[PDB]
Amino acid sequence: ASKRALVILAKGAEEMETVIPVDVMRRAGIKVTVAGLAGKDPVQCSRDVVICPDASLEDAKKEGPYDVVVLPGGNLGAQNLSESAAVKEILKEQENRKGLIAAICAGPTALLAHEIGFGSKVTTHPLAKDKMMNGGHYTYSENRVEKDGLILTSRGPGTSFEFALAIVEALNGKEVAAQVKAPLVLKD
Amino acid sequence: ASKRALVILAKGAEEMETVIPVDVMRRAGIKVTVAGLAGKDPVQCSRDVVICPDASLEDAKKEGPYDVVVLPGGNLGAQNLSESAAVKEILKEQENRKGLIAAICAGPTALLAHEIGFGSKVTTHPLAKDKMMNGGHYTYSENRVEKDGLILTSRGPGTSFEFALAIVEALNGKEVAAQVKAPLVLKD
């Protein structure tokens, strides 16, 4: 059985935080669906890179369930994710079935908006800490990648490779992650 | 005066090696044009990420000159770049006016195809070394980023941040590169 990943892509998303996990996961043999929050139309990311999604979120929602749901960062992208009822439904369903939820940079603040994983240890971009910690519902970590139960978080664009390889390790195991890592020419 | 960068995007390009420099350069205030080799149509990258270029290469060619020309990697992307007469013209013109040329991963093999910068020290992805060194026209380096004169090269997807920041440093100086680097949460 092939593992499946849902990447939710909204206007203002950080394009590096979107493309790196998608690329690395597909290198790992994972079937990745880049789903546009607003539909199938091309999405303008935070630094004006325009990415064409594979499907609308409405259509991808019907082809579940997914072994991981991935929330990229970018301040405005994360705000759009935080305001979407469709994202709320997807995340709550994923939480209930004990599937993996992965969010990077500003992305984790959507978990707060939708009341997902309260009590977990999480990290964010340093500039998103105060927002994430409103109410004290999580415990904050400064680790570059943090995994507490089914909640996997990471800090920023420069942690995107470590974030993506952590997803691969969680889904396909340490050996696949190591095999995928070698041709990337990462430092550590 | 605002610096200008041309990123040439061909089918089969490595999408991480394309988006990271584009994003980082725009964070540095550089005006970046992502030009499609085959036209304005969306480009399917090596791991099936589809990126919409800002312009066709034919149109971007007329809005020169550029302070840097950037050649992403990806084996099939680099082959398409190596076979394009339009790329040859752009690179030869850039060489003659002593503008910066930057290529990453498999991208530098296009310099060999078009007889650009012979005698320079260069690096490539390890799997592209033999191709680059056919004839002994360059001197090979295993540094993660290599800069010899106006030729800047880098090794792979995992060196894309260092590659992009080297471009920023060359164009805008060390202080801007350091300012752009801090919010990325890079390790070193």
UniProtKB/Swiss-Prot annotation, chains A, B:
Lipidation (S-palmitoyl cysteine): C45, C52, C105
Site positions (Cleavage): D148, G149
Active site feature: C105 (nucleophile), H125
Annotated GO MF terms: cadherin binding; copper ion binding; cupric ion binding; cuprous ion binding; cytokine binding; DNA-binding transcription factor binding; enzyme activator activity; enzyme binding
Residues bearing PTM Cysteine sulfinic acid (-SO2H): C105
Induction statement: By hydrogen peroxide and UV irradiation. In pancreatic islets, expression increases under hyperglycemic conditions. Expression is also induced by sulforaphane, an isothiocyanate obtained from cruciferous vegetables.
Phenotypic consequence of D148A: In PARK7; loss of protection against metal cytotoxicity; decreased detoxification activity on methylglyocal-adducted CoA
InterPro entries linked: Class_I_gatase-like, DJ-1, DJ-1/PfpI, Prot/Nucl_acid_deglycase
N6-acetyllysine: residues bearing it: K147
Top-level EC class as recorded in UniProt: hydrolase
EC number from the UniProt entry: 3.1.2.-, 3.5.1.-, 3.5.1.124
Entry keyword annotation includes Cytoplasm: yes
Subcellular location: Cell membrane; Cytoplasm; Nucleus; Membrane raft
Outcome of mutating A178T: No effect on detoxification activity on methylglyocal-adducted CoA
Entry comment on modification after translation: Sumoylated on Lys-129 by PIAS2 or PIAS4; which is enhanced after ultraviolet irradiation and essential for cell-growth promoting activity and transforming activity.
Disease: Parkinson disease 7: A neurodegenerative disorder characterized by resting tremor, postural tremor, bradykinesia, muscular rigidity, anxiety and psychotic episodes. PARK7 has onset before 40 years, slow progression and initial good response to levodopa. Some patients may show traits reminiscent of amyotrophic lateral sclerosis-parkinsonism/dementia complex (Guam disease).
Assembly and binders: Homodimer. Binds EFCAB6/DJBP and PIAS2. Part of a ternary complex containing PARK7, EFCAB6/DJBP and AR. Interacts (via N-terminus) with OTUD7B. Interacts with BBS1, HIPK1, CLCF1 and MTERF. Forms a complex with PINK1 and PRKN. Interacts (via C-terminus) with NCF1; the interaction is enhanced by LPS and modulates NCF1 phosphorylation and membrane translocation. Interacts with NENF.
Protein's name according to its UniProt entry: Parkinson disease protein 7
Organism: Homo sapiens
